[PDB]
Amino acid sequence: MPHAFKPGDLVFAKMKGYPHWPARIDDIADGAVKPPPNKYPIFFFGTHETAFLGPKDLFPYDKSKDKYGKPNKRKGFNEGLWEIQNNPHASYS
């Protein structure tokens, strides 16, 4: 049975106007800006951008990859697919 989201979990994350995007739940570094309540820091593969999202926009990657894990014209998307499959836990800073 599922647990709550934790840092390191792999997802597709949904933002308005964008396709479901390969991403991970990030940690928050000591001294770094914390997300709003009930939101998680999402790191988007390929673009390497961070946004704050709640669980309604987070789809576990294993369950969802068949549907959302296909190449997309959008900037950074195919690089992101490579990252989440090949080195999802690396530093991309």
PDB file of C-alpha atoms in Angstrom:
ATOM      1  CA  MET A   1       0.000   0.000   0.000  1.00  0.00           C
ATOM      2  CA  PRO A   2       1.238   3.555  -0.833  1.00  0.00           C
ATOM      3  CA  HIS A   3       2.914   5.871   1.634  1.00  0.00           C
ATOM      4  CA  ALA A   4       2.972   9.662   1.458  1.00  0.00           C
ATOM      5  CA  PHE A   5       5.391  11.264  -1.007  1.00  0.00           C
ATOM      6  CA  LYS A   6       8.970  11.543   0.251  1.00  0.00           C
ATOM      7  CA  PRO A   7      12.216  13.044  -1.193  1.00  0.00           C
ATOM      8  CA  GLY A   8      13.649  10.850  -3.919  1.00  0.00           C
ATOM      9  CA  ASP A   9      10.333   9.631  -5.176  1.00  0.00           C
ATOM     10  CA  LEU A  10      10.057   9.675  -9.002  1.00  0.00           C
ATOM     11  CA  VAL A  11       6.941  11.096 -10.668  1.00  0.00           C
ATOM     12  CA  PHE A  12       5.371  12.702 -13.633  1.00  0.00           C
ATOM     13  CA  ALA A  13       4.327  16.169 -12.393  1.00  0.00           C
ATOM     14  CA  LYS A  14       1.504  18.201 -14.015  1.00  0.00           C
ATOM     15  CA  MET A  15       1.629  21.998 -14.504  1.00  0.00           C
ATOM     16  CA  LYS A  16      -0.968  24.049 -16.422  1.00  0.00           C
ATOM     17  CA  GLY A  17      -0.134  24.249 -20.120  1.00  0.00           C
ATOM     18  CA  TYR A  18       2.535  21.573 -19.950  1.00  0.00           C
ATOM     19  CA  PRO A  19       2.466  17.791 -20.574  1.00  0.00           C
ATOM     20  CA  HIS A  20       2.875  15.502 -17.525  1.00  0.00           C
ATOM     21  CA  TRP A  21       6.611  15.997 -16.976  1.00  0.00           C
ATOM     22  CA  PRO A  22       9.358  13.642 -15.585  1.00  0.00           C
ATOM     23  CA  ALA A  23      10.339  14.911 -12.138  1.00  0.00           C
ATOM     24  CA  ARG A  24      11.401  13.992  -8.612  1.00  0.00           C
ATOM     25  CA  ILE A  25      10.423  15.053  -5.072  1.00  0.00           C
ATOM     26  CA  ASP A  26      13.440  17.033  -3.884  1.00  0.00           C
ATOM     27  CA  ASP A  27      14.875  17.475  -0.424  1.00  0.00           C
ATOM     28  CA  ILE A  28      15.011  20.960   1.046  1.00  0.00           C
ATOM     29  CA  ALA A  29      18.629  21.882   1.849  1.00  0.00           C
ATOM     30  CA  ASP A  30      19.448  23.325   5.263  1.00  0.00           C
ATOM     31  CA  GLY A  31      18.990  27.132   5.050  1.00  0.00           C
ATOM     32  CA  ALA A  32      16.896  26.937   1.900  1.00  0.00           C
ATOM     33  CA  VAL A  33      13.431  28.363   1.214  1.00  0.00           C
ATOM     34  CA  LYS A  34      10.708  25.917   2.365  1.00  0.00           C
ATOM     35  CA  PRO A  35       7.636  25.127   0.193  1.00  0.00           C
ATOM     36  CA  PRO A  36       4.163  26.372   1.176  1.00  0.00           C
ATOM     37  CA  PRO A  37       2.193  24.033   3.524  1.00  0.00           C
ATOM     38  CA  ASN A  38       0.916  20.824   1.882  1.00  0.00           C
ATOM     39  CA  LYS A  39       3.203  21.400  -1.145  1.00  0.00           C
ATOM     40  CA  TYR A  40       6.341  19.497  -2.165  1.00  0.00           C
ATOM     41  CA  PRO A  41       9.445  20.851  -3.972  1.00  0.00           C
ATOM     42  CA  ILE A  42       9.357  19.253  -7.425  1.00  0.00           C
ATOM     43  CA  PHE A  43      12.511  19.141  -9.510  1.00  0.00           C
ATOM     44  CA  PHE A  44      11.729  18.823 -13.220  1.00  0.00           C
ATOM     45  CA  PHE A  45      14.167  16.717 -15.200  1.00  0.00           C
ATOM     46  CA  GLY A  46      15.563  18.158 -18.431  1.00  0.00           C
ATOM     47  CA  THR A  47      14.595  21.778 -17.617  1.00  0.00           C
ATOM     48  CA  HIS A  48      16.108  21.459 -14.138  1.00  0.00           C
ATOM     49  CA  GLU A  49      13.454  23.860 -12.842  1.00  0.00           C
ATOM     50  CA  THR A  50      11.758  23.680  -9.422  1.00  0.00           C
ATOM     51  CA  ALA A  51       8.088  24.325  -8.680  1.00  0.00           C
ATOM     52  CA  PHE A  52       5.895  23.621  -5.630  1.00  0.00           C
ATOM     53  CA  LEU A  53       3.068  21.176  -6.214  1.00  0.00           C
ATOM     54  CA  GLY A  54       0.595  19.141  -4.216  1.00  0.00           C
ATOM     55  CA  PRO A  55      -0.257  15.408  -4.637  1.00  0.00           C
ATOM     56  CA  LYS A  56      -3.089  16.037  -7.057  1.00  0.00           C
ATOM     57  CA  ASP A  57      -0.480  16.924  -9.712  1.00  0.00           C
ATOM     58  CA  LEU A  58       1.962  14.063  -8.840  1.00  0.00           C
ATOM     59  CA  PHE A  59       1.728  10.721 -10.648  1.00  0.00           C
ATOM     60  CA  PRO A  60       4.078   7.902  -9.528  1.00  0.00           C
ATOM     61  CA  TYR A  61       6.550   7.250 -12.315  1.00  0.00           C
ATOM     62  CA  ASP A  62       6.428   3.449 -12.421  1.00  0.00           C
ATOM     63  CA  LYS A  63       2.621   3.284 -12.775  1.00  0.00           C
ATOM     64  CA  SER A  64       2.466   6.218 -15.239  1.00  0.00           C
ATOM     65  CA  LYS A  65       5.466   5.837 -17.565  1.00  0.00           C
ATOM     66  CA  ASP A  66       3.548   3.756 -20.109  1.00  0.00           C
ATOM     67  CA  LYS A  67       1.201   6.699 -20.665  1.00  0.00           C
ATOM     68  CA  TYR A  68       3.391   9.736 -20.062  1.00  0.00           C
ATOM     69  CA  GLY A  69       6.913   8.512 -20.891  1.00  0.00           C
ATOM     70  CA  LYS A  70       6.910   9.140 -24.639  1.00  0.00           C
ATOM     71  CA  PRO A  71       9.049  11.769 -26.470  1.00  0.00           C
ATOM     72  CA  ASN A  72       7.559  15.281 -26.649  1.00  0.00           C
ATOM     73  CA  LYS A  73       8.447  18.330 -28.724  1.00  0.00           C
ATOM     74  CA  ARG A  74       8.679  20.562 -25.659  1.00  0.00           C
ATOM     75  CA  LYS A  75      12.012  22.063 -24.631  1.00  0.00           C
ATOM     76  CA  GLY A  76      13.930  19.839 -22.198  1.00  0.00           C
ATOM     77  CA  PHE A  77      11.401  16.984 -22.218  1.00  0.00           C
ATOM     78  CA  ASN A  78      13.464  14.282 -23.972  1.00  0.00           C
ATOM     79  CA  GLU A  79      16.545  15.133 -21.913  1.00  0.00           C
ATOM     80  CA  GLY A  80      14.272  14.767 -18.907  1.00  0.00           C
ATOM     81  CA  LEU A  81      13.141  11.304 -20.008  1.00  0.00           C
ATOM     82  CA  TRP A  82      16.797  10.269 -20.173  1.00  0.00           C
ATOM     83  CA  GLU A  83      17.525  11.653 -16.724  1.00  0.00           C
ATOM     84  CA  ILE A  84      14.624   9.996 -14.904  1.00  0.00           C
ATOM     85  CA  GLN A  85      15.445   6.590 -16.524  1.00  0.00           C
ATOM     86  CA  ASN A  86      19.239   6.706 -16.306  1.00  0.00           C
ATOM     87  CA  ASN A  87      20.347   8.842 -13.334  1.00  0.00           C
ATOM     88  CA  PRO A  88      17.272  10.126 -11.464  1.00  0.00           C
ATOM     89  CA  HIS A  89      19.111  10.766  -8.195  1.00  0.00           C
ATOM     90  CA  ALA A  90      22.132  12.699  -9.484  1.00  0.00           C
ATOM     91  CA  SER A  91      23.064  16.275  -8.745  1.00  0.00           C
ATOM     92  CA  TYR A  92      21.888  18.459 -11.674  1.00  0.00           C
ATOM     93  CA  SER A  93      23.004  21.726 -10.029  1.00  0.00           C
TER      94      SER A  93
END
